[PDB]
Each structure stands twice: as structure tokens, then as C-alpha cells.
Design a protein around this ligand. Sequence first.
Ligand code: FJ0
Ligand code: FJ0
Ligand code: FJ0
Ligand code: FJ0
Lengths: 289, 283, 284, 286
Amino acid sequence: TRFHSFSFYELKNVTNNFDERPISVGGNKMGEGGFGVVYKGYVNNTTVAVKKLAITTEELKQQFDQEIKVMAKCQHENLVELLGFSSDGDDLCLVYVYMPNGSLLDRLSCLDGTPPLSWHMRCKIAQGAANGINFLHENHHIHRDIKSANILLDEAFTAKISDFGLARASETVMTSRIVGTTAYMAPEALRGEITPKSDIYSFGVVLLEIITGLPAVDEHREPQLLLDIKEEIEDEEKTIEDYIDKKMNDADSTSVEAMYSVASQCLHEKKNKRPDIKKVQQLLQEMTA
Amino acid sequence: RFHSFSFYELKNVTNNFDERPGNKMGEGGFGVVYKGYVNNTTVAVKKLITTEELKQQFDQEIKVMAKCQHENLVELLGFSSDGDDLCLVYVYMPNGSLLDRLSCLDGTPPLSWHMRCKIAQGAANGINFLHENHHIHRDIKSANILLDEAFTAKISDFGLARASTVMTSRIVGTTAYMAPEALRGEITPKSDIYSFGVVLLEIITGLPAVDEHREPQLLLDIKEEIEDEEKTIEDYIDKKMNDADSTSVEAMYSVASQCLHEKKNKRPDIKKVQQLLQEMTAS
Amino acid sequence: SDTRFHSFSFYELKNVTNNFDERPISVGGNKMGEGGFGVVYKGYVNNTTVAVKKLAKQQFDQEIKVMAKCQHENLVELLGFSSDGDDLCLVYVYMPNGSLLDRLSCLDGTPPLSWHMRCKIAQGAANGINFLHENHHIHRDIKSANILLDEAFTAKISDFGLARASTVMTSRIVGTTAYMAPEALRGEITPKSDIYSFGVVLLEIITGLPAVDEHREPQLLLDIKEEIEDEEKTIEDYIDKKMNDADSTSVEAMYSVASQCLHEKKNKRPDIKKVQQLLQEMTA
Amino acid sequence: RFHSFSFYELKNVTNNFDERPISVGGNKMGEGGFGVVYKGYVNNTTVAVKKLTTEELKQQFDQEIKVMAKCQHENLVELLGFSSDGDDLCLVYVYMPNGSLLDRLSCLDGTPPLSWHMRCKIAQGAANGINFLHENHHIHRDIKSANILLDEAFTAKISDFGLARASETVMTSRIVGTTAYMAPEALRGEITPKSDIYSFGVVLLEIITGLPAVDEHREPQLLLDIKEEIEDEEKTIEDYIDKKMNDADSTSVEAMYSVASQCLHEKKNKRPDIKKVQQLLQEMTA
Ligand SMILES: Cc1cc(-c2nc(C(=O)Nc3cc4oc(N5CCOCC5)nc4nc3N3CC[C@@H](O)C3)co2)ccn1
Ligand SMILES: Cc1cc(-c2nc(C(=O)Nc3cc4oc(N5CCOCC5)nc4nc3N3CC[C@@H](O)C3)co2)ccn1
Ligand SMILES: Cc1cc(-c2nc(C(=O)Nc3cc4oc(N5CCOCC5)nc4nc3N3CC[C@@H](O)C3)co2)ccn1
Ligand SMILES: Cc1cc(-c2nc(C(=O)Nc3cc4oc(N5CCOCC5)nc4nc3N3CC[C@@H](O)C3)co2)ccn1
């Protein structure tokens, strides 16, 4: 697949000179992303998302081409679509289809006054995110930064996996540059292994965010790491019922426990005992049914 | 794909379709709408010219809702084709219709100008999605804009909807909201724009599109009264608001006026309506 | 003050009403409404919100005299006046929920009055009229714009500029047409005219409709009495739809009182005491 | 003044006082001060029914009726009636369709976050309620977000006067209230309206942050403590602002915080009286 080539000055124009104030107070910045800031833009009659990158100039320019290459290969309804890029100006820009409901993280926390996601939407988002990861793994790609901040939500709350700057081919390797987000990372990934099984672990953490509405890490909390509640639940002090996000009216026990069962399996500490993504899809399908 | 229900599950969940205000929430497009509880989810169940036509607007609705999923459209959860009657099941809208909130029915407080602007933008995003996907609603009106827990606008009732100018023998819709061409049997998305213009006047004035005990009886007519400078839009602003500034109201009115152009071809398309409604909250 | 009648200077009142700013309070002004032969502004004296009536009337003195005599929990309190300056001012305790008319129409975004509050307001307004009649005063302009509502939605009758001690006749027929008894429209002055006007207020309370609407059928709210007695419609059909808590039995009981109040023969109307009793029995 | 109900009418209309939550098909809406609160339908009116040794409970029954008879204001929940005749003692109130401020601050059961604009209105309204109580020489003794109810228009209504007292400083043996909201002196048995001011200050911090007054799984566990963290300049109020708002400007938030800070003065006598709190909250809007 080949993409539209934009000039920097069109993107500068349509993002109001890359206005770094939030959209809520009249600016253009929607979020800070993987190695770059994400601005809102209007090209033609289309709202778009423009990522301006901002490790070193060698590495950033390398994760520019990686992203384009992976997005050229990987097109699926549960992955964010790349519209284009810009190499010519000062900074390197990537241009995406606009996701009007932002990230799952932000909707889980009801940021900027948005209403809480129903259990029904949450189930759809979980199934969708898993279809996206399944497509990546079937096509021998490892994401390496699965987390709620990288699951975007469109006009219909369809889940879209985003940020393939870190992504790799399959077609277990090791690396010196350990990258990702600590609170979502599998033990092996924290030690430099690169395997699709790390993606499964991180998805398990996402499923706990979906059930509880709690962020993966909160410095002002006990436990500070959301994965730890798996331990608290297995040692029967608490139950999953006790952690269910209280900002839902429509969550039945049976379906929540079924999603938890999937998350628990995804969070197995031995990489080899985790289910593969296909098993995760199937289990998430059976949950609805 | 949607959950396929048996009639007896829906009968169970609506307390045998209890027609007291009970389980009945309202009368809808060619059917009655009941409240239901499946698991811990509140839902809306619509139980449904001739025997040929109703069964035809059943499949139309499912087909359109299969294609059309958007945050500003009511979501179809499922249906039931067995049993005596045909049932459609939807996500429950705890704030009911815009018409009812505009009239403060059952003691609900008046919508602020701020919510009104959000509802207008939301309804237009819904219509835009329908038109982009080559669907014409044909019955845009405040009774078919539903409001969720956060007052997000949801377009509903796609029984009359059509794929994409044609003509017809069966002229359908709501008279007080209809464009002249639609009243003569044309079928175009431009008729939806006109009807949206009427909705925007309901939002600004809080008046229903038609009141038998009124002058003018048709809300559209105030456009004429305003253009011939006897009155101004300021004079029609819903008095049940404290937070409506002139500039933003006049900007919404400007959009409604353009939507209500009598020549279909001079009306703006829905995309232009979105843009104009966005600029109103800035600018 | 707190136990006294304050004599105010014009310049204090001018100061505290922002030079009598005639823009509405909603858009940052001081005007709250137009009243009986004057405009009513919001004011701040000390830490007290107040209502200042500048006339827009000659019979300034009537109002002061009647308010000096007539003090009751269901009548607005006069705090003071000002006879110096250009204009004549009357100063009242501020009524934070405004007029019944404005709350019936949900003006400025206020929520609809429940049936429960409506019943309390009806009973309260009648206690006020009863106090006036017991003390041999006739109001002459009973209407929903002259029933004010305090912090607790207690009804307070206001505007005694037209009041008399509360049968007499007159040349200057005064009042509000849509609320007026036939005899009052012909110049009679009797407390029985107050009862008739109260009956109209009770219909506003039940229906939420104003006494007169030029864009309506019937244009005069009184007329629904006829439409109901000739069995085309029923009172159930006119109940304000902006209520969730109105039961038929209590609404019909209030209507029964309004119907009796609206008898066209002044002598067949109940006196205010009977109206109180009937409104008490209604609660339930 | 109040409608007298028979127990069996109230039993009927609350589905035999079904103590399961409304979410799982029951009638219980919450636990109150020495009683449970159920949902009920009498005539066409939704209502709230509070079902409460024999001497003390029957004494807080008459206290509540007596205080509610005296204290009527738009920012206080209205008593509709009572029932003395059955097994248990019942109090019946106007139904508050938006529940408690606590529950709306936490977006319980999927309700959307309160805007800063509504939050300011709720704060002003709650203070008008407390001001009415203090002007009439009543002390609430359990001011907290669970006892500020919200009607169809999000008007604040102070509720639960079972613990309330006349003025209109006394002491007591039975120390009552909610620990996380209580002034130091109230925790030691003093009874003064100044304790109400302190508790209101905590409510204002809940409004600004959206955090509950106490969370066992948190640091600090007591919301009051953020006052210390802010005064010792590690953090600022900006850092604690509820992120579930789009419309909160710094200037107005800092002004509400200034009021809360003053309300939370540890020396009871340096706290502002409720009238000063109203004025400051008025100036904040603007
Ligand atoms: C890092 C990255 C991002 C993307 C990519 N991003 C978008 C995109 O459209 N994003 C986006 C849109 C938003 O719209 C709102 N709105 C405010 C709340 O109410 C509703 C409206 N917030 C939003 N926040 C967003 N953030 C920005 C980065 C991330 O935190 C998600 C599309 O691709 C692609 C590849 N790599
Ligand atoms: C015709 C049609 C309707 C729908 C569809 N309808 C709903 C739905 O939830 N409906 C609904 C919900 C309501 O909730 C309340 N409130 C409760 C709180 O207090 C104030 C009253 N009123 C309500 N009225 C409703 N009406 C029922 C008739 C229709 O005009 C909308 C959802 O899909 C779909 C497709 N075709
Ligand atoms: C004619 C006359 C008037 C008075 C007298 N008037 C007030 C007084 O306080 N009045 C008043 C208060 C108000 O408070 C609000 N609100 C604030 C909350 O939000 C919604 C707006 N609106 C209001 N309007 C008012 N008007 C004034 C004309 C009358 O139709 C009602 C007190 O005595 C006395 C003797 N003769
Ligand atoms: C202790 C006490 C209470 C009352 C008194 N209580 C109500 C009342 O109406 N209460 C109430 C209503 C509610 O409505 C919802 N809903 C869920 C969210 O969506 C909207 C609907 N939750 C609700 N919770 C309530 N509780 C009551 C205890 C407290 O936890 C809050 C009225 O007087 C009076 C005197 N002493």
C-alpha cells in the first residue's frame, strides 16, 4: 500500500502552526504519543490526526519508516488507518484517520467530562482490540506497547490499535534497547525478550483496566500496579466483584467473571502457559453468548 | 450481527408487554415502545399500513441499523421474527426524546443553551453519517432525536429510511417538518436538511413544530415573520433559558434559515451544517 | 434596623441598584420586572438582597399605609421607602423565587413546580387573602404575577397600590382584565372580586397556562370552565404536563374550589374562609 | 403539618421494605443516620422512605420531625410525612432523582461527571442550606457529600437531621458523625456550628477533586491531608483538580479552594462563619 504525500506547510497550516494547547482551551494538541505529539487537523472536509515526532534523530527517523512500513502491510478495521506522511519540512509527520472518541485510557477515566463506558461498549471494545492483535500476530507482527492509551475509539466506539513505531516481525529474539510501558509489560519483555506472548500479557492488563476502570499504575494507590489485583483475588482476600468499575449500571457478574478469566490466563507469569491471541478472541466471543 | 431473540424472552422481559405507563414508554414509528431488563441492562423493545408493509419496514430497519453504527444513532441490540408480533430491541435512552425535554414533560428541567448546542451538533453528526452512507432518514424531527444519560443526541426510527432524485406514490413523514418537495413525493437527502432546520428552530424557541392553538401554527413560518422585520430571532428565544447569548443563538438561527431555503438546491449539505454548528461554539 | 421601617435616601438606592440598570439580571443588569405602576430592581443594602420599586404614581402613600397595617407571613414585607430624589421608591424583602407566573412558565430555566409545592402555594396565597379580608382590605389585582415566592416557596401576596378598605362603585376601573370578575369590570369594588381572581390563579396552578394567551383557544383561561362543564373536555385533559406528581383526586378537588370561585353571580361564590378550608381538606 | 401514613401503606409501596439495592431489583437506596432509605411510590409521587434501643431511636424520630417542622428551605430535603403506628418508625421525604453528591462525584451507576458550573451551583446551594440551619440556631453534625442530595435540577438539598441540635458550646458523651469529615473538636465531643463549617470544607475538596473524603486504598487516605501537601508546596491545587471536568478555570477553582482552606482551619475560632462562606462562594462566580 502507498499513502498520500503531504507537505509540512499544509499540515502546519491545518493544525494552526502545531498549537500545543489542549483542544478544550481552543488549541490543537490531543495527546502526547509514542515519541511525538498528536494534533487535530482539517484537510479538505476531513478531520485528521497529525503526529509530529520529537531518543535521537537516527532512532526517530527509523521509527518513522517502521510505522509507515507496518501500516502499509497491516490494514484491518481494528487498526488505525494511516492516511499519509510528510518527510520534507523541519519535523517528520504522520497523518491518521481521526478517532473522535480518543483513547480507551481517557474514556476509562472519563477525562474532559465524557460519560462512563457501559459494560456493553466495553465488551465490544475488548473483542475489537483482540481482533486487531490477532491480525497483527497472524501477519507475524509484534506490537510491543499494547495498552489502553494505544487503543483508540472511533465514532462508533470501534477499538483501533495504534502506535506501531515499536513493532517487529516474527518470521524468540533479544534486544539491548528495552522499550515499552512498564506497568503493562510482561516480565520477559522487561528483560529484553521480544515475543508475541508479551502482547498477550499486556492485553491482560488492558482487560483489567476495562473491568475496573483503574489505570495500570497509580502512584497514590495500593497496589500501585493493577496486575497485582490478580494476586489479591487468587489469595481470596478480595474477589473480582469487589473491583468492578462502579461507574457501570449494566455489568452482570457472569460476563465480568468471564472477561476476568481471560485476563487471568493472559497474565500467567510463564510466557508459555499464556493463551495465544486466537484463544483470547474465542473466549471473548463466548462471553457474549 | 445482532442477538436473535425469541418472542417469549421479550414477552418475559417487558412483563407481558404491559401497556400501562407499567412498561409502555411511548408510541413510535408504526409500533409501541416498552421498557425491558435483560441481565443488568435496561433496554427499549419496539413491538410493531398492511401485513406486507410492516414486515417490510422491519427488514429495512435491521438492514439500515446493520450498516449504520455511530454514536449519534440509537443502537439496535436485536430483533425477534418468530411469535405473533415483530420486535426490535434497542439501547435504552434514559432522557427520552428532545421533543419531550424541550417541553419539560414529566417535570424535567429546561435544557440549557449549552446542552442545546451539544444536542444540535450531535444530531447533525448523526445525519451526516446517514448521508455519507447514502441513507435518507425521511422523518427527522425532535420526537426522533433521543437523549442518553449524558444528553448525547441519538437519531432513531429508520423504518422509513431509503438508499441513494426519485419520486414516490406513498408520501410519508411528518407534515410540520417536511420540505415542500418531500410533500410532493420527491425523495432526496435535501429534505432531511430542511427537517433538521425545523428541529433547530424547536431548539432555539422551545416551541413545537406545529401547535393547533397558535399563530403561526407552523414553526417554519417564523422565518418569514423574521425576514419581513416585524419580529427578530431574539423575540422567539426560549424564555426557559438563562444562558443563551445573542451571538450564538443568531449563529444557530443562520444555519436553520439556510436549512429552511424553499429551493432544495440552495440548502447547504449536511457537512456544511456540521461545520457551521462547530464554528458556533468558537466564533 | 431589622425590626424598623428604614427611611432611605434616593442616592443609596441608586447606588445599590447600579443607577437603576434597566437590563435583565440574567444579562448582568438590575431589572427583575415591571410592577404595578413602576419597575422593580434588585438591590444590595448591607448584606441583604432587596427589591426596589421605582414608581412611574401618587398613591405611594396607600401602599405604605396598607403595608404598615398589614403584616402576615403570606404577604411581602416592606422594608422602607424614599421620598427625596427625583423618583419615589419602595423597598421590599427580596423574594428569591420570583413570581408564581414566572415559575409556572419556568422562566430563566427554573424547573417546573411539583404538584406538592403548587398545593402549598395555593394554601399560602389563600391565607394571605384571608388576612387581607379579615382586616377589611380588598386587593383588586390578585393574579399569579402578584404572588411572590420566598426561599422556601412560601406564597407572598404583593402589590397593594390598588388596595381599598371595606359594595362601592368607581369611575377608575383598575386591575388585570383576564383575572377580573364581571362586576369588577363594571366598577363594583367588593372582596368577592378577589375570590374570582383567586379562582383564575388556581386554574393557572393546575394547567400551567397563563390567564390570557393571544396565540391560543380559548384565549382566556376562565373559558375552560365552560368547556369542562359542557363535557367536551375534562380537567384531567388540562393538567400541566410538566408535573410527575399530580393525582386526579387532588387536582379535581382544587378545580372544584376554582369552579366555585369562578361563579359569575358574586353572591354564590364562597368567601375566602371557605376557600382556605376547602384547600386544607384537599391535602387530607 | 405533615401527612400521617399507616405502616401498611409504606410497606406496600416499598415492596415490603426490600433491602436489596435498586440496581439488583430491590428498594434500598442507601443507609442513613440510624435507618435505611427505600424508594417508594405513593399516588403518582415517587418518594423516599426512611425506616429507623427504643428510647433513643424514638427520640431521634421526634427530633427530625421537630427540626423539619421548623426548618423549611429550598436547599433542605422536605419531609412529606411519617408513620408511628406499625412495628418500625418511618419518615417519608420528597424523592431526589439525582441521588447524593457523593454518588454523582464518583459517577456511580453510569451517570456523567458534574461540570464545574454545576459544581459551583451545588456548593452555593449547600451553603445556603447550612446558612438557614445556623441562622435558625441548628447544628447539623453530619455534613458530608452523602447528605447533600440532588433534585431533578441538581439543586443541593441538605438531608439527615436526626443528629441535629439547637444552639440557644456544649459537650457530649455520645460522639456521632463521620470521621473523615469531622472537625477535631467534634471528634472530642464538642458541639458547635463551627464543626459544620469544617465538614463543609471537606465537601468543597470533594467537589474540586472528585475524590472521596476517605479511601482505604489511597495516599493520603484522608482527603483533608491534601491541604497540608499543598501548603508545604510539594503539590498545588491545580494538581488535584478532578480531571473529569472540561470547564474548570484555575481562577475559580483556586477561589473555591481558598474557601475550603479557611473552612479547614484547625482552630475552630479562626474558621469563617457560614455567611462568610456564602459571600465568598458568590464572589467566585463574578
Ligand atoms: C500515538 C498515535 C496516535 C495515533 C492516532 N491518534 C488519533 C486520534 O485521532 N487521537 C485522539 C483523538 C481525540 O479526540 C479527542 N476528543 C476529546 C474528548 O472528547 C472527544 C474528542 N480526544 C482525542 N485524543 C486522541 N488521542 C491523541 C493521542 C492518544 O492519546 C489519543 C488517530 O490516530 C496514531 C498513531 N500513533
Ligand atoms: C420509535 C423508535 C424508538 C426507538 C428507541 N426508543 C428508545 C428509548 O429508550 N425510548 C424512550 C426512553 C425514555 O425514557 C424516558 N424517561 C425516563 C426518565 O424520566 C423521563 C422519561 N422517556 C422515554 N421515552 C422514550 N421514547 C419511547 C418513544 C420514543 O419517542 C422515545 C430507544 O430506542 C428506536 C427506534 N424507533
Ligand atoms: C410589584 C411589586 C413587587 C414587589 C416585590 N418584588 C420583590 C422581588 O423580590 N421580586 C422578584 C424577585 C425575583 O427573583 C428572581 N429570580 C432569582 C432566581 O432566579 C430566577 C430569577 N426573579 C424575580 N422577580 C421578581 N419580580 C419583580 C416583579 C415580579 O413579577 C417578580 C419583592 O417585592 C413588592 C410590591 N410590588
Ligand atoms: C438519610 C436521609 C435521607 C433522606 C432522603 N433521601 C432521599 C432520596 O431521594 N434519596 C436518594 C435518591 C436516589 O436516587 C438515586 N438514583 C441512582 C442514580 O441515578 C439516579 C437515581 N440514588 C439515590 N440515592 C438516594 N440516597 C438516600 C441516602 C443516600 O445514599 C442518597 C430523600 O430524602 C432524608 C433524610 N435522611
